[PDB]
Ligand binder design. Structure first.
Ligand code: NA
Ligand code: NA
Ligand code: NA
Length: 9
């Protein structure tokens, strides 16, 4: 969730 390019984060 913290990383707008990474659906898992
Ligand atoms: Na994300
Ligand atoms: Na950030
Ligand atoms: Na990233």
């Amino acid at each position: 969730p913290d990383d707008p390019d990474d659906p898992d984060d």
